[PDB]
């Protein structure tokens, strides 16, 4: 039940079949509810010396994958009547053979708007809709139900189904792809179309506030300012911008008589608090002073 692929068998290249399962089977797959892949037949070679294949009750496994295995393994003419079930393999699967292409792509820092080719199966009634998948994907080493568009006419109408992605982190790469949800009809089924995986990177925007800043003076002239980076940089940080400004002395200090006996001059539950700091974090969405643009550093 737990397996979606047999690819974990990374180096398996031979099954000899010197011993076989009853009915002379060297490879037998029965009642694997989530199995979608055997091996990636574009990369993996597997040889089966003797014996047949048995496949029953693999609802997510396309018959094409099984037929590819027969081709790869050299088992092609070995299977007899009902060794591989036609009705219990792939019956519940995405065996999209056709290609949907994106007609339109638009970024916002928080949003992605997409359009894509309209798909219409033979009996268009059989189109249940579209399905858009997106995940945050930092490396390109890689759910929404979209109602079917407005059918009846086809002259000059952008019946391009689309979707506005709204959640999204800014300056973030998204793996995205669309699929057609259809009806396994009473005849030679229509498998439909899926788009390929496209990556889309949201726009950046203004960075979060620099965190935990500390101001110290080891010297009579030096100030050592240190800080941690914004909790939400929303982009590749270029620099930090520090301004300093000398504060004038307390006006009133020049007009107090300090010989007047009052000469004290200045010698110049945890998860309720956690959520508190976090509340304002979440609430947080000409003249010239001496400044400095701090590059590739978190101190000044």
């Amino acid at each position, epitope marked *: 039940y737990a397996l979606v692929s047999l690819s974990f068998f990374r180096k398996l290249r031979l099954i000899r079949g010197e011993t076989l399962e009853i009915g002379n089977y060297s490879f037998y797959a029965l009642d694997n509810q989530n199995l979608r892949q055997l091996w990636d037949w574009s990369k993996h070679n597997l040889t089966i010396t003797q014996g047949k294949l048995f496949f029953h009750y693999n609802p997510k496994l396309c018959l094409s994958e099984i037929h590819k295995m027969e081709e790869v393994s050299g088992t092609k003419g070995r299977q007899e009547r009902n060794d591989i079930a036609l009705k219990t393999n792939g019956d519940q699967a995405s065996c999209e053979n056709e290609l949907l292409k994106f007609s*339109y792509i638009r970024t916002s820092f928080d*949003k992605i708007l997409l359009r894509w080719e309209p798909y219409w199966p033979p009996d268009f009634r059989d189109l249940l809709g579209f399905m858009l998948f997106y995940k945050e994907a930092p490396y390109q080493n890689v759910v929404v139900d979209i109602d079917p568009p407005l059918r009846s006419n086809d002259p000059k109408s952008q019946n391009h189904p689309g979707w506005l992605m709204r959640g999204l982190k800014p300056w973030t790469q998204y793996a995205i792809f669309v699929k057609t949800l259809v009806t396994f009809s009473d005849e030679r089924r229509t498998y439909g179309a899926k788009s390929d995986i496209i990556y889309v990177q949201t726009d950046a925007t203004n960075p979060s506030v620099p965190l935990d800043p500390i101001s110290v003076s080891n010297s009579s002239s030096q100030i050592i300012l240190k800080w941690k980076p914004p909790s939400d940089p929303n982009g590749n940080i270029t620099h930090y911008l520090v301004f300093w400004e000398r504060q004038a002395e307390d006006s009133e200090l020049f007009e107090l008589d300090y010989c007047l006996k009052g000469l004290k001059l200045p010698s110049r539950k945890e998860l309720e608090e956690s959520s508190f700091r976090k509340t304002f974090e979440d609430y947080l969405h000409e003249e010239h002073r001496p400044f400095e643009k701090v590059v590739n550093k978190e101190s000044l």
Partner: antibody, heavy 109, light 108 residues
Framework: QVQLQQSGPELVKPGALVKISCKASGYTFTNYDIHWVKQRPGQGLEWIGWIYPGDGSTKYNEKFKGKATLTADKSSSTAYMHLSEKSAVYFC??????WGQGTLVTVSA | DIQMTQSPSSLSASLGERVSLTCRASQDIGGNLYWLQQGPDGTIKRLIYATSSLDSGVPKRFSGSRSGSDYSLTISSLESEDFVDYYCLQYSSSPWTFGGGTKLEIKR
């Protein structure tokens, strides 16, 4: 029928500001981006920016940042562009699939 | 920004000639390319979306392809109405950018 009906031609005095319209028909104005392009006589096309009418959300090309301002009137299903030189044609397009007729803006005293 | 380098600037051809235009992208546009046609009226029509997908009622003589960073618009057999201006447009990233354009002339 998806249609984008434009304004003009606009004959304006130098230094005056001008507002051009793009009236949408045949679709839900709210749900699709309106893009604007500039074309100098005999030259090529240039992207100005876009606006999402439903959201009022906008995005500009750096080279038009202050020169153009995109607005939309959901109640009228019209997109507008207010500008700040010499002749230039301005186009309106619904996600590049449907184009307006183009408005001719001539600057002369 | 992604620069779309469109060649040739002009192309003289005759009725019935197969011709092609090319757009070379600065950066990978992953097939997010459109082809626009602009007539003498100044009216722009989108012909192709997604590199090779033909828009509705765009004659079957128009076609698109890609090989590497080079994207092409091919007109299998020119008809009089085709001797206009063409521009490509990338929609891969943030500032949508166009090719310089190509003007079709009748060779005489």
């Amino acid at each position: 029928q998806v249609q984008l009906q434009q304004s003009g031609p606009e004959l304006v005095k130098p230094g005056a500001l001008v507002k051009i319209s793009c009236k949408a028909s045949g679709y839900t104005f709210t749900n699709y981006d309106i893009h604007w392009v500039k074309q100098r006589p005999g030259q090529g096309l240039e992207w100005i920016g876009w606006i999402y009418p439903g959201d009022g959300s906008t995005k500009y090309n750096e080279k038009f940042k202050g020169k153009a301002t995109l607005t939309a009137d959901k109640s009228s299903s019209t997109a507008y562009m207010h500008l700040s030189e010499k002749s230039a044609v301005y186009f309106c397009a619904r996600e590049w699939a449907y184009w307006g007729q183009g408005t001719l803006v001539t600057v002369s005293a | 920004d992604i620069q779309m380098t469109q060649s040739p600037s002009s192309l003289s051809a005759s009725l019935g000639e197969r011709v092609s235009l090319t757009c070379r992208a600065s950066q990978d546009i992953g097939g997010n390319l459109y082809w626009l046609q602009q007539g003498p009226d100044g009216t722009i029509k989108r012909l192709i979306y997604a590199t090779s997908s033909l828009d509705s009622g765009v004659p079957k003589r128009f076609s698109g392809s890609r090989s590497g960073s080079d994207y092409s618009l091919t007109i299998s057999s020119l008809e009089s109405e085709d001797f206009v201006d063409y521009y490509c447009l990338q929609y891969s990233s943030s500032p949508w950018t166009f090719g310089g354009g190509t003007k079709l002339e009748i060779k005489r």
